[PDB]
Amino acid sequence: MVLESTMVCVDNSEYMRNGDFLPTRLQAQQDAVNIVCHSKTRSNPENNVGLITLANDCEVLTTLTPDTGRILSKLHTVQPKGKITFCTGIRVAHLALKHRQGKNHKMRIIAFVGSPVEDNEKDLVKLAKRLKKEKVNVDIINFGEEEVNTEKLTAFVNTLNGKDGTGSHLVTVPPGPSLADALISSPILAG
């Protein structure tokens, strides 16, 4: 509800295709979206979802659209190949919000991080710095078994929520084959 618009940030890195959870982290991702996009809808009957690839460069599949089936079908044919460019990834989702539908929709993007993340800190703070300037909260979900606790995003998420800025939270998953299921509950619950 609250007229929210989420711009999903899908991952398709080459090391993301190993099945350490169950049906490889491709169906694990597809089931993950299904339990969020539909969960993302059904609260306010005017919402919006958009899937963006974190492949080598600017790769966006579906834009801001109330429909639900387009994203799921468009998820297929997404076989992973290549490296992940996180720093230049969120900004692409950032612009999508700027050129949105009726601007009365709250803006948020959930991240779908995965295969080994690459960042140099500092810049990440700037990456989080700008988004926190303009009525934007991001939701990076730790996944794909990156470095334990992902102590590079840790300096990232806190920046957005800093100064008592309650909002989205970092979510991690056990390296073992823990089914995605409803395990993602920190943002959906109240954030």
Partner 1 sequence: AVQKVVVHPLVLLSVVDHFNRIGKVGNQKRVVGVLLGSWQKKVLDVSNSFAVPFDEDDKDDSVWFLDHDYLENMYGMFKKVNARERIVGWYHTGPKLHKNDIAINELMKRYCPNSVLVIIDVKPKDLGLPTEAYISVEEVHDDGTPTSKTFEHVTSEIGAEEAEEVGVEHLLRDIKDTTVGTLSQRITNQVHGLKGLNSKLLDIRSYLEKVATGKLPINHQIIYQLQDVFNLLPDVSLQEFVKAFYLKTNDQMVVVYLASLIRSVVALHNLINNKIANRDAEKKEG
Partner 2 sequence: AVDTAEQVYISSLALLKMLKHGRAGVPMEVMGLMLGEFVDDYTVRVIDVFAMPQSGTGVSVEAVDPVFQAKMLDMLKQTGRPEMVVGWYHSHPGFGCWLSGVDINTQQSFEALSERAVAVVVDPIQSVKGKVVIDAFRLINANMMVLGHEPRQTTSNLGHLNKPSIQALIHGLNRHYYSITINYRKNELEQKMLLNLHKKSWMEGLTLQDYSEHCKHNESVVKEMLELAKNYNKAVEEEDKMTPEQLAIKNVGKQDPKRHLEEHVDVLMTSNIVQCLAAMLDTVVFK
What SS3 class is residue 26?
helix
Decide which of partner 1, partner 2, none touches 101; Cβ closer than 5 to 8 Å per partner kind.
partner 2
Shortest approach of partner 1 to residue 96 CB, angstroms?
6
Between strands 106-111 and 137-140, the pairing is parallel
* Residue 70 CB partners (closer than 8 Å, separation 6+): 62
Shortest approach of partner 2 to residue 90 CB, angstroms?
22
Decide whether 37 or 171 has the Cβ nearer to partner 1. 37
Shortest approach of partner 2 to residue 105 CB, angstroms?
12
Q: Which of 105, 89, 164 is nearest to 132 (CA)?
A: 164
Site residues (CB under 8 A) for partner 2?
A: 99-102
What SS3 class is residue 128?
helix
> In angstroms, what is the C-alpha Rg of the chain?
15
Decide whether 38 or 98 has the Cβ nearer to partner 2. 98
For the CA atoms of 114, 97, 156, 57, the dihedral, rounded to the nearest 10 degrees, stands at 50
* C-beta separation of 144 from 136 below 8 A: no
Shortest approach of partner 2 to residue 2 CB, angstroms?
21
Decide which of partner 2, partner 1, none touches 135; Cβ closer than 5 to 8 Å per partner kind.
none
Whose tokens are 């995965």? That residue is 114
Decide which of partner 1, partner 2, none touches 57; Cβ closer than 5 to 8 Å per partner kind.
partner 1
Decide whether 53 or 62 has the Cβ nearer to partner 2. 62
Site residues (CB under 8 A) for partner 1?
A: 57-58, 60, 62-65, 88, 91-92, 95-96, 98-99
